[PDB]
Amino acid sequence: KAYRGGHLTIRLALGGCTNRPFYRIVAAHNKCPRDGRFVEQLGSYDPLPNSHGEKLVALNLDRIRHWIGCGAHLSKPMEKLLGLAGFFPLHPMMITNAERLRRKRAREVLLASQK
Amino acid sequence: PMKGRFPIRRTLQYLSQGNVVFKDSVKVMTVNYNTHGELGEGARKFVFFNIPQIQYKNPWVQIMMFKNMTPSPFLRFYLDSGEQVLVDVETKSNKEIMEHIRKILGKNEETLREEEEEKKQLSHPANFGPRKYCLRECICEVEGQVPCPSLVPLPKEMRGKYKA
Amino acid sequence: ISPYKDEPWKYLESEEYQERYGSRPVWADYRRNHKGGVPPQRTRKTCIRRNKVVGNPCPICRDHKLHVDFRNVKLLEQFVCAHTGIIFYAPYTGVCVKQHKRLTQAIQKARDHGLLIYHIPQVEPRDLDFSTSHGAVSATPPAPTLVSGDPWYPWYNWKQPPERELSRLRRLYQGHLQEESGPPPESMPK
Amino acid sequence: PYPPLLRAMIIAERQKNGDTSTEEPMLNVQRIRMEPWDYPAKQEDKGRAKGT
Amino acid sequence: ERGWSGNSWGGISLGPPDPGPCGETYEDFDTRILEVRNVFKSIRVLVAVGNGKGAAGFSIGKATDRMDAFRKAKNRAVHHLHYIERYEDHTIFHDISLRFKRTHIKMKKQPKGYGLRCHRAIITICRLIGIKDMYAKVSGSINMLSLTQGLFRGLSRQETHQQLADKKGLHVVEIREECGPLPIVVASPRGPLRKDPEPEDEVPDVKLDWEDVKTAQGMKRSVWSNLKRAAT
Amino acid sequence: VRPRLIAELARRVRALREQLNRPRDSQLYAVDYETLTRPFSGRRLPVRAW
Amino acid sequence: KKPTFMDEEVQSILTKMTGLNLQKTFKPAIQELKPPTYKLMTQAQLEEATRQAVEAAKVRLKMPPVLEERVPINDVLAEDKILEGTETTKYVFTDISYSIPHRERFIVVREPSGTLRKASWEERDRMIQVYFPKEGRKILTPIIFKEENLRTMYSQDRHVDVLNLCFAQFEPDSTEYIKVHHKTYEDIDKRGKYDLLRSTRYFGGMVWYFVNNKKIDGLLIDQIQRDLIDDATNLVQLYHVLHPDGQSAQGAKDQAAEGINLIKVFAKTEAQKGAYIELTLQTYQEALSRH
Amino acid sequence: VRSSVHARWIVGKVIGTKMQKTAKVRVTRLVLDPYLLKYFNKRKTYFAHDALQQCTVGDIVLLRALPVPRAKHVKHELAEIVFKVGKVIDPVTGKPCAGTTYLESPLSS
Amino acid sequence: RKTRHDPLAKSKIERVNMPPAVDPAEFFVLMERYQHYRQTVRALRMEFVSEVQRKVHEARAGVLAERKALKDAAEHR
RNA sequence: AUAGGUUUGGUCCUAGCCUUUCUAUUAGCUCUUAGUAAGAUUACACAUGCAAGCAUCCCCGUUCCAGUGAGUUCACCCUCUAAAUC
Ligand code: FES
Ligand SMILES: [K+]
Ligand SMILES: [K+]
Ligand SMILES: [Mg+2]
Ligand SMILES: [Mg+2]
Ligand SMILES: [Mg+2]
Ligand SMILES: [Mg+2]
Ligand SMILES: [Mg+2]
Ligand SMILES: [Mg+2]
Ligand SMILES: [Zn+2]
């Protein structure tokens, strides 16, 4: 199928069931449906903690590197995941949101002290 | 019962029992053989029993037969480079002919094993998807992970209906 | 009310059981009533509905002294092929679907507790090489930033902008300004 | 510096291949010239609104 | 207990055969009705008897009264017994393909626990003979008398492993997948053993059945095959 | 394959009519300073530009 | 140096001590059955088939390597304090590139505190089972390995089944593997069930454990009672090479003890029940003279 | 990479020579019947450029793909004549033959 | 979704998208953080691209592949 | 198909029809709770409301997603080679 423009992008395809999400890390054309045709499955991500309290993330680092070197883009959630894995620098918004949460809880603690 | 002499020839097991997988150079195989004459007996057997297997393992190689055109039977292979390989098969048994062509133009076991290992890499066991391609469909099939809501209702705190 | 509920296996060593069944399986004499020569491919869902037994109860439901318990090994053995180690499907013995599910769970629990003998294969090792010298399982040399206690990259930390740049931003966003944020708390507030 | 995990993988591969040098792996960024976002773009490549 | 159906005589037991005039008792033999027919009136009954240990037979009885026909068939059956060889006393020694008149019967030896997946009359006769594991397919006309005659003929004309060894003068070696490459010698020649090996037939000229090949290749699609059924 | 000539005809006619009725910069980038909209399209300009 | 378990001489001694019973090695399995096949064979063909079966059994009896308990993995890759408190559960990142050995594959954990550390051994094995499932292994440890169920399995004389389950479930150098194997060996020694492991691949490991813990008296007694005198002498020689500075080995060198005399020297020097060893050896010699 | 024609080398029998410098050649391949699992001949016609018009009806010829088709139906050229109709030279011995009989004895040389 | 031929809803004709308020210090710090992060990510992308090209060059016109090709040709001869 | 019923005064053979099995839709009668999956008959006609914005103006997007199954060997492989991403 020929799309006008577009590019390959490594992103998260949502599967699972209602109230039980699960993600597949796939390299696919940006114009394709979210859960539709893909070029290669590059990993997976279970956002629900398991019986060990762990969120499991599988990354095909070799193929991820190959597709990045082949010109594939990255969705923001995948960039944040790779930053958490240590594969990239921490995304600026992770740091900014951490600081925002710090300030919010500082305000709440000051409210508690004031009361 | 199944029609014809030696009906076993028309079973997928027999057809897949062949051990000759040609190198990519081979494009055409001509089989010149004679219908009568004891010295050509093996060649006739080679046509009767082994050509189906050779074709089954090599679908894209053009095999063509010729009958009583020369005083003796022989095989000729035409390669992509333009080279031609002539194999005289008079006085040879069909098994001998099969072994000879395997030796001179057949991929060795090592190349076949490498190709099989290459085929293995495409089916990554860790991938999730439909059963036609993947071992498992969902991470919920993994023990210790949160199970499917179809089989085990999720706790009410984890359901949007009771979070809204 | 069965006296064998706490110790079900005793029932299979009692003379009453021997008189009733002898040496044959408890399902030997059962026969499903159905139309046609080919039976339905599933047994009934259950023989007991609201504490009432149906006319032709299955082998397990027709005898109340037979308890499907993972300790009742000798009973569970009668529902597994002794030559192949496979649990019979419900139409084979005629046990209802509910009791078949209970029997399957009991057999699995007995096998898990080592009470029921089953064929355990001899498998090959996972890894060809058992070396643990690779960095993935060994220790990686710490990076200088980790040693010094600094963040991995300098920009992970807050740097207060110069006053001039903040003034440009305030000029650029006249009338659409929020309160300036100071440096964040160093540690996560508790 | 490389990211933590990537640095660890590079060092692990080096140690596997016999290299024992203690130099840190580093990413060269001299060739990465950060143009400001407000730098003028190429107007020759830009499109034009269509008549409607 | 009912037979093959509620209103059917077939499969019903007639009890042990009567003590014969020869002075022998047959308390160990069980009798089963295979067919009851009205002859135009009299009754013609086909019954089979067997002791569960290889000795089995069958007979026809004709009489105006049904009970007299049963008694005649049973007493005549006990005096026309076959002996059926059994491999390890549970199955037949080899696959048997036979045609009696217009009835074709294909029987296959099966491992232990396979059960009797056979025509119901074949199941009854096999229970009488003592065969416990076998597959059977009946084709052509399903005529009860021809079926019984063909079954007894084929089962009586099976070559045991000892017979094969004595004929070929060679060790009969069994290969079981469950037992790995261990060769199990099931029969050895009573006389001397030939020192020359059998010809290594590269392709045997056997007559294959298209149904078996289709089943092996997965091209059989019947909705009626391999259906769940009660123990037999 | 039954040729679709009308498609080519329409494509050529549209290309010609687009190259001969090109809107000029005076039409494209005019602005109504009271409402800050483009009269050519009617689209309002972003707030930060006003 | 001291011979390793995989030393050629040690491997040969343990292979000969194990024995090869084709009936026990290829005992009929309880699995899906198919109709058997038949072949007409001459005596030479039968002997060739038996020889091939012997080679297959030799492949089947290949002793697993004996490995030392692995050192715990405690390595930190990064400490990103900025991420402290931004998450409530840990992230486990497994590299699933296909053509990587599982002991060289990077598996890391980002903790809620912001620490990026390497995965522990148990987490590594769990992840490898999650993404590269292996037949016979489970992600959650089976309950059969609890002490009560292991006791039941021992009572049923199913030690080989226990060892097969352990091999399938645990890695050779893991703590659980070593603990279960040691319990199995201890029970075998306590109840004189060494014959259960003969003609199996676990006999060599059991013998190695007994020799290294200096508890070969029961195995010597069993071998003497079973008239496997060559095995007893080979066991004594193995004990002496693994403990060449022991009084038993020095006694053997001083008295120049060979054959049964080696057993006598061991019984007199460094046997916990040398008296019973001497009694059994004397009975064996008397029975041999009578025969 | 060397040609856009699918069939690179093929062997066939010349069935027509009525076109100028073009031989119509019949090529037979073996195709498995999915139901009977037997191999049957499937025939296809090819036009081969014969610049010298040296092909005769009935001879067995080798066709080599052109780098690009020179006409609508001409995608090949005549590489050689494997067997000249009625003028076969035994490849094994190199001597003329008429069917299964040698026209010239191999011993003569 | 709508196509370019579908008309705009009549309840949105008077809609004005008011830009969000800006925190100056956070804005400046975030701009710097994005700049540094994108520079690092382009460096990493360059390394990955070079790796891909080098693998392709090692596969075609390599050295071990060249040995393999020569060995296979000599075997054929 | 492990097969069964039905032609004749009767037997055997051939042969059709039907029975038994498993799904999907609709209809009758009857239906309590929870989780999950699926969900016009009609390429017939459509009231009404929404489904495409973003952005310091240019551009970019609205060519995607979503829908239907009317027509129907434009889908797959190779050669060559535009547009697009790096
Ligand atoms: S199939 Fe996994 S959540 Fe439903
Ligand atoms: K825009
Ligand atoms: K349609
Ligand atoms: Mg009835
Ligand atoms: Mg009929
Ligand atoms: Mg929709
Ligand atoms: Mg679409
Ligand atoms: Mg239509
Ligand atoms: Mg281009
Ligand atoms: Zn029941």
Side-chain angles (χ1 to χ4, degrees):
Chain A
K1 196 193 163 133
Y3 275 116
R4 194 181 151 290
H7 51 80
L8 293 187
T9 177
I10 301 159
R11 58 191 199 186
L12 297 176
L14 172 68
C17 281
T18 305
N19 299 313
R20 200 272 188 270
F22 168 58
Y23 296 105
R24 295 174 330 244
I25 304 156
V26 293
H29 298 88
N30 64 306
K31 296 309 193 332
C32 278
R34 184 191 61 201
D35 307 340
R37 181 174 48 90
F38 58 90
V39 184
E40 191 163 6
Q41 190 177 139
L42 305 184
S44 49
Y45 168 39
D46 186 3
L48 299 186
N50 58 14
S51 64
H52 295 268
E54 311 191 300
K55 285 160 178 214
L56 297 193
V57 192
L59 297 164
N60 202 319
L61 292 183
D62 282 338
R63 298 308 291 167
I64 286 160
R65 277 182 247 125
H66 167 264
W67 283 114
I68 290 169
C70 283
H73 291 213
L74 301 175
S75 78
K76 267 159 72 46
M78 252 304 296
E79 282 205 319
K80 314 215 181 183
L81 268 185
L82 285 176
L84 284 167
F87 189 75
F88 291 169
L90 288 174
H91 198 261
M93 281 325 290
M94 261 186 288
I95 298 145
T96 311
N97 281 322
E99 293 173 349
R100 288 164 169 186
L101 191 48
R102 276 170 170 204
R103 287 188 196 100
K104 216 189 82 192
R105 297 210 189 302
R107 271 200 291 289
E108 294 176 354
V109 163
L110 290 175
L111 284 175
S113 79
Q114 191 262 321
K115 293 172 40 55
Chain B
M2 273 176 88
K3 294 165 176 300
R5 279 179 310 124
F6 295 94
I8 193 61
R9 295 174 298 142
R10 294 162 38 232
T11 71
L12 285 182
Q13 206 175 79
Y14 182 91
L15 287 176
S16 78
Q17 267 165 32
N19 61 344
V20 178
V21 181
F22 287 128
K23 298 180 176 69
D24 306 308
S25 56
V26 185
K27 286 320 192 282
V28 181
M29 182 207 199
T30 64
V31 182
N32 283 72
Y33 74 105
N34 297 332
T35 53
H36 287 93
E38 310 268 340
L39 292 189
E41 180 66 75
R44 279 190 300 276
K45 275 199 71 193
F46 177 72
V47 170
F48 192 83
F49 287 106
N50 308 125
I51 292 297
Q53 294 171 317
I54 289 160
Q55 189 67 89
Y56 191 72
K57 277 310 190 42
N58 303 282
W60 314 131
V61 171
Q62 192 216 333
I63 302 174
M64 192 145 168
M65 269 83 78
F66 302 102
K67 297 174 75 172
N68 308 301
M69 288 193 45
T70 57
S72 59
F74 63 92
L75 309 181
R76 189 136 54 176
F77 303 86
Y78 299 80
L79 309 186
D80 203 46
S81 54
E83 188 187 336
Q84 297 176 13
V85 193
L86 178 82
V87 182
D88 183 48
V89 297
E90 181 147 52
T91 57
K92 281 194 179 233
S93 87
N94 66 303
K95 174 156 210 74
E96 281 157 44
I97 298 159
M98 200 85 167
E99 293 302 79
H100 179 102
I101 65 182
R102 189 206 195 188
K103 187 150 152 271
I104 63 170
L105 280 167
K107 291 180 183 178
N108 59 2
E109 294 293 328
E110 291 80 1
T111 313
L112 299 175
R113 185 177 65 247
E114 295 208 321
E115 273 147 4
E116 293 212 341
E117 182 65 26
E118 285 306 285
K119 299 305 297 157
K120 273 185 71 132
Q121 210 167 10
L122 300 168
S123 47
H124 204 309
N127 288 7
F128 292 92
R131 204 51 200 90
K132 181 195 241 183
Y133 310 96
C134 300
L135 301 167
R136 299 160 294 190
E137 293 155 40
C138 200
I139 198 70
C140 72
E141 291 158 46
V142 183
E143 183 178 1
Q145 312 289 114
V146 174
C148 198
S150 179
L151 299 171
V152 186
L154 281 157
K156 302 192 82 95
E157 71 176 299
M158 272 170 90
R159 297 167 42 199
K161 176 155 147 207
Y162 295 90
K163 291 185 285 186
Chain C
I1 298 166
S2 170
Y4 293 100
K5 184 88 203 159
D6 290 331
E7 321 196 290
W9 58 93
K10 255 68 157 164
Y11 177 51
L12 263 64
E13 300 136 11
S14 86
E15 191 47 31
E16 170 166 0
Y17 172 96
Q18 203 68 25
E19 188 257 349
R20 200 196 157 127
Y21 303 108
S23 71
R24 298 287 308 309
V26 299
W27 49 260
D29 75 289
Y30 183 72
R31 181 169 181 167
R32 272 169 84 207
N33 302 314
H34 62 87
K35 69 195 286 203
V38 183
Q41 289 306 284
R42 43 148 191 79
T43 52
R44 69 172 62 101
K45 183 176 178 180
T46 178
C47 308
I48 299 152
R49 289 180 181 271
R50 282 155 200 191
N51 284 317
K52 313 279 181 311
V53 188
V54 296
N56 199 17
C58 84
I60 296 292
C61 295
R62 73 176 163 190
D63 191 309
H64 53 287
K65 282 158 170 129
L66 287 178
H67 311 292
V68 180
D69 185 324
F70 78 103
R71 302 168 280 137
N72 201 358
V73 170
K74 285 323 171 303
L75 177 66
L76 300 178
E77 272 165 29
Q78 303 175 33
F79 292 90
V80 179
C81 188
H83 311 105
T84 67
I86 293 157
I87 310 162
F88 300 129
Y89 47 71
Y92 188 87
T93 68
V95 292
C96 54
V97 176
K98 183 183 161 214
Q99 285 312 314
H100 186 262
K101 285 182 210 244
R102 294 203 328 124
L103 277 156
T104 296
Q105 282 164 60
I107 285 152
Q108 185 71 351
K109 203 183 175 182
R111 283 167 170 173
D112 295 341
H113 280 78
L115 298 170
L116 197 65
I117 297 169
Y118 72 111
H119 173 254
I120 293 140
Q122 171 185 119
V123 301
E124 283 288 79
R126 189 191 74 200
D127 310 310
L128 307 191
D129 212 21
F130 303 112
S131 179
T132 63
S133 55
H134 200 265
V137 288
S138 298
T140 291
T145 51
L146 197 52
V147 178
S148 59
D150 292 327
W152 199 266
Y153 293 109
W155 45 274
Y156 286 5
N157 275 354
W158 181 270
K159 263 296 298 163
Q160 185 86 41
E163 267 279 12
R164 171 160 191 94
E165 292 307 301
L166 296 178
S167 183
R168 322 176 100 88
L169 281 169
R170 278 194 302 273
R171 182 177 51 183
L172 184 54
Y173 297 109
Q174 318 204 20
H176 302 88
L177 267 171
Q178 263 184 0
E179 182 60 355
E180 290 144 345
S181 287
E186 295 101 307
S187 66
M188 182 66 208
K190 284 290 211 56
Chain D
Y2 279 76
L5 182 74
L6 200 45
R7 210 197 55 101
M9 311 216 308
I10 278 158
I11 292 171
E13 188 275 335
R14 288 174 57 257
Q15 274 168 25
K16 184 177 180 180
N17 264 27
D19 202 298
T20 50
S21 181
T22 58
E23 280 74 1
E24 289 294 281
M26 295 299 291
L27 272 164
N28 198 69
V29 297
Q30 264 172 311
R31 287 198 302 299
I32 316 306
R33 284 151 210 111
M34 281 325 268
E35 294 296 349
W37 57 267
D38 56 328
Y39 191 89
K42 314 292 270 193
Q43 182 55 44
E44 298 108 339
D45 304 335
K46 211 166 284 193
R48 195 167 159 97
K50 305 284 152 263
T52 46
Chain E
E1 51 85 10
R2 69 171 159 264
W4 301 329
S5 298
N7 216 59
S8 167
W9 276 110
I12 291 180
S13 184
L14 286 173
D18 295 294
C22 55
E24 196 69 60
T25 56
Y26 310 103
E27 68 275 17
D28 198 66
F29 280 80
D30 181 39
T31 306
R32 294 274 166 173
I33 300 159
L34 294 178
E35 193 192 29
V36 171
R37 196 198 292 260
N38 296 334
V39 176
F40 268 107
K41 189 212 85 180
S42 66
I43 306 288
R44 180 189 88 139
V45 186
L46 169 60
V47 311
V49 304
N51 69 340
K53 286 131 60 192
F58 68 100
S59 175
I60 294 189
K62 299 185 75 105
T64 60
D65 168 52
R66 193 161 31 249
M67 282 296 118
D68 297 335
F70 290 156
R71 183 207 61 239
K72 277 192 234 183
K74 190 164 54 163
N75 292 343
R76 186 175 178 278
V78 289
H79 290 107
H80 292 81
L81 289 171
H82 291 275
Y83 189 77
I84 311 296
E85 288 305 323
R86 287 172 309 146
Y87 165 92
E88 275 172 77
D89 298 343
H90 80 92
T91 190
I92 58 178
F93 275 96
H94 54 81
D95 293 3
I96 299 156
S97 284
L98 61 83
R99 185 197 91 255
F100 187 84
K101 273 153 204 205
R102 294 291 88 194
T103 304
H104 313 250
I105 312 183
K106 303 152 272 312
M107 301 165 268
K108 289 189 197 135
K109 164 191 196 140
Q110 297 291 335
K112 276 163 154 309
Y114 183 89
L116 291 172
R117 291 166 52 155
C118 301
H119 189 283
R120 61 189 184 180
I122 300 181
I123 293 173
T124 301
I125 291 158
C126 280
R127 279 194 203 125
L128 290 174
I129 292 168
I131 289 158
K132 263 172 289 294
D133 305 288
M134 181 162 92
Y135 170 79
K137 183 64 177 92
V138 190
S139 313
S141 59
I142 308 299
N143 188 248
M144 200 39 77
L145 192 45
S146 278
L147 181 142
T148 312
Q149 290 211 251
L151 192 73
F152 268 98
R153 174 181 261 210
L155 288 175
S156 85
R157 287 170 196 186
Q158 59 190 314
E159 210 187 40
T160 71
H161 293 325
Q162 187 61 68
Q163 274 164 39
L164 172 70
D166 297 326
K167 164 184 71 179
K168 284 292 221 312
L170 285 153
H171 292 314
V172 182
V173 176
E174 200 186 72
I175 300 297
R176 284 171 171 300
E177 293 179 353
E178 72 258 40
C179 298
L182 181 43
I184 299 96
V185 192
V186 299
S188 302
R190 294 182 261 241
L193 185 141
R194 304 161 61 251
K195 262 67 202 172
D196 57 289
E198 276 309 309
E200 282 75 24
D201 200 336
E202 197 259 322
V203 184
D205 199 352
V206 290
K207 295 214 73 47
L208 310 172
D209 263 347
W210 175 228
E211 291 311 279
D212 304 344
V213 173
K214 213 201 313 187
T215 299
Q217 293 179 356
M219 293 180 183
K220 191 74 170 134
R221 314 171 261 141
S222 192
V223 301
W224 299 99
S225 284
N226 292 57
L227 284 190
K228 309 200 179 182
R229 281 177 206 248
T232 61
Chain F
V1 175
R2 177 172 60 189
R4 292 214 178 151
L5 304 169
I6 308 191
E8 294 294 328
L9 187 153
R11 188 270 299 164
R12 184 178 295 112
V13 167
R14 264 193 262 99
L16 173 83
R17 286 199 220 283
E18 192 88 70
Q19 293 284 60
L20 296 191
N21 264 267
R22 285 170 309 130
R24 303 307 181 97
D25 291 331
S26 57
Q27 324 187 52
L28 282 175
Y29 314 129
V31 65
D32 186 331
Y33 295 94
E34 311 306 320
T35 62
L36 300 149
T37 57
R38 298 289 189 188
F40 188 82
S41 46
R43 302 160 153 240
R44 221 175 290 118
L45 300 174
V47 185
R48 267 178 196 169
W50 284 1
Chain G
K1 52 154 285 172
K2 206 204 305 165
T4 62
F5 172 82
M6 292 307 272
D7 181 87
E8 290 84 300
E9 301 96 41
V10 182
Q11 287 292 89
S12 87
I13 297 161
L14 296 181
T15 297
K16 170 162 204 321
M17 222 183 297
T18 298
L20 190 84
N21 182 312
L22 276 185
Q23 320 299 313
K24 183 176 178 180
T25 311
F26 295 120
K27 196 147 186 54
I30 305 297
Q31 54 174 42
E32 279 277 270
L33 298 178
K34 294 180 185 177
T37 47
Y38 297 91
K39 275 212 181 143
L40 301 162
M41 281 194 216
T42 63
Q43 188 61 44
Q45 292 181 292
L46 172 69
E47 274 144 1
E48 166 209 344
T50 310
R51 194 191 61 61
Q52 292 189 232
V54 162
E55 295 305 290
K58 273 161 173 171
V59 176
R60 201 151 181 294
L61 293 198
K62 285 282 192 312
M63 281 165 307
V66 176
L67 297 187
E68 182 85 31
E69 185 178 1
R70 54 211 189 174
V71 182
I73 298 172
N74 277 277
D75 195 57
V76 165
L77 293 183
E79 281 261 22
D80 304 324
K81 294 272 141 203
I82 183 60
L83 298 181
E84 174 200 316
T86 69
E87 282 277 339
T88 61
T89 43
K90 70 180 72 71
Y91 285 82
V92 181
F93 300 94
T94 302
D95 176 24
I96 58 165
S97 303
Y98 187 69
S99 54
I100 302 191
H102 291 325
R103 300 186 180 265
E104 304 177 30
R105 157 188 320 281
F106 266 91
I107 310 171
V108 294
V109 179
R110 178 73 78 173
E111 292 261 33
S113 63
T115 302
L116 187 68
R117 53 153 183 99
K118 291 187 170 135
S120 85
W121 277 119
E122 286 75 45
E123 298 161 344
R124 285 188 65 86
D125 290 343
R126 272 211 330 282
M127 295 298 102
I128 289 154
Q129 184 55 30
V130 165
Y131 302 115
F132 299 86
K134 193 179 131 59
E135 262 293 308
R137 194 162 295 209
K138 296 284 152 200
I139 298 167
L140 300 183
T141 302
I143 58 169
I144 186 55
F145 298 111
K146 285 199 221 155
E147 71 166 40
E148 50 256 57
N149 308 306
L150 281 190
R151 252 187 313 266
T152 309
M153 281 275 257
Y154 299 154
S155 302
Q156 296 160 149
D157 283 34
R158 293 173 69 198
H159 297 70
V160 173
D161 282 333
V162 167
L163 295 181
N164 272 322
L165 280 170
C166 198
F167 193 88
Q169 179 58 39
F170 301 116
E171 283 297 285
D173 52 328
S174 81
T175 313
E176 296 88 2
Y177 181 102
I178 296 170
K179 199 174 306 298
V180 169
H181 273 237
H182 281 67
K183 291 176 73 70
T184 310
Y185 299 159
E186 188 65 26
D187 195 84
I188 282 151
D189 185 279
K190 283 200 276 224
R191 310 172 55 216
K193 301 296 184 53
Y194 315 99
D195 187 73
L196 288 178
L197 274 68
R198 249 181 290 265
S199 181
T200 64
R201 63 172 185 188
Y202 307 108
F203 196 81
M206 182 205 48
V207 170
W208 185 261
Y209 166 67
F210 289 157
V211 176
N212 281 119
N213 289 71
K214 297 146 280 284
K215 303 193 327 297
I216 67 161
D217 310 294
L219 184 57
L220 288 172
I221 287 162
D222 188 75
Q223 279 150 326
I224 285 159
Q225 290 171 335
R226 292 191 187 269
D227 293 28
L228 298 173
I229 185 55
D230 183 19
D231 290 347
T233 61
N234 260 325
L235 182 55
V236 175
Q237 279 151 74
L238 196 85
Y239 185 98
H240 284 166
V241 55
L242 290 179
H243 301 101
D245 302 343
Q247 162 208 320
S248 65
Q250 301 308 293
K253 291 171 71 175
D254 298 330
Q255 286 94 302
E258 298 298 329
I260 298 164
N261 292 325
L262 261 173
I263 305 171
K264 301 176 155 306
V265 175
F266 181 89
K268 288 175 200 131
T269 59
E270 184 178 1
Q272 283 82 321
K273 43 170 70 56
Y276 194 50
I277 301 179
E278 263 303 295
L279 171 53
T280 53
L281 199 49
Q282 183 177 1
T283 314
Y284 152 76
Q285 293 187 137
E286 276 168 353
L288 188 153
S289 300
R290 292 176 254 163
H291 279 308
Chain H
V1 57
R2 323 181 70 253
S3 180
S4 57
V5 176
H6 178 79
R8 304 273 210 109
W9 298 93
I10 53 174
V11 167
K13 182 167 87 214
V14 169
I15 51 157
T17 61
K18 264 165 167 46
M19 275 183 279
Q20 310 194 289
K21 288 167 152 145
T22 313
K24 184 161 62 181
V25 184
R26 172 169 289 151
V27 168
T28 61
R29 292 169 180 100
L30 285 179
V31 177
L32 184 65
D33 192 298
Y35 180 54
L36 306 172
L37 288 185
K38 189 180 156 164
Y39 272 106
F40 290 94
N41 269 307
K42 185 177 182 293
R43 47 178 61 178
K44 189 157 194 272
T45 300
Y46 288 89
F47 294 177
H49 187 63
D50 188 358
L52 301 202
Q53 284 199 157
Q54 87 200 9
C55 276
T56 310
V57 168
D59 52 2
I60 307 304
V61 293
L62 177 71
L63 311 185
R64 180 208 296 115
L66 288 166
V68 59
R70 64 174 291 127
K72 183 162 171 152
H73 296 296
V74 189
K75 314 163 280 150
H76 290 81
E77 57 163 321
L78 169 79
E80 66 182 1
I81 303 186
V82 188
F83 300 124
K84 196 68 189 81
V85 56
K87 275 174 239 193
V88 176
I89 306 302
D90 188 32
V92 177
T93 62
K95 298 293 180 185
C97 64
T100 312
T101 300
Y102 285 108
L103 287 178
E104 184 193 333
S105 179
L107 303 174
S108 79
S109 67
Chain I
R1 288 193 94 174
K2 312 174 59 150
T3 72
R4 64 195 69 215
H5 307 301
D6 291 311
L8 172 63
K10 304 283 151 143
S11 50
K12 299 168 67 182
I13 299 284
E14 301 269 12
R15 195 193 147 257
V16 290
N17 186 9
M18 292 325 188
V22 160
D23 186 5
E26 190 207 278
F27 195 86
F28 188 88
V29 171
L30 195 47
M31 263 190 301
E32 292 267 280
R33 278 178 186 153
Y34 270 110
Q35 181 171 65
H36 285 130
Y37 171 82
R38 293 211 166 108
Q39 183 183 53
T40 308
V41 165
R42 291 181 179 91
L44 287 161
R45 171 173 301 271
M46 281 185 188
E47 300 307 79
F48 299 158
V49 168
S50 300
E51 284 154 27
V52 162
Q53 302 214 240
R54 184 217 57 230
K55 294 181 176 67
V56 170
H57 186 261
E58 271 176 290
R60 80 209 197 90
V63 65
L64 188 153
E66 192 176 10
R67 162 192 312 143
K68 173 168 200 83
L70 276 187
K71 182 155 149 146
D72 273 28
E75 281 203 89
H76 174 66
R77 227 179 317 283

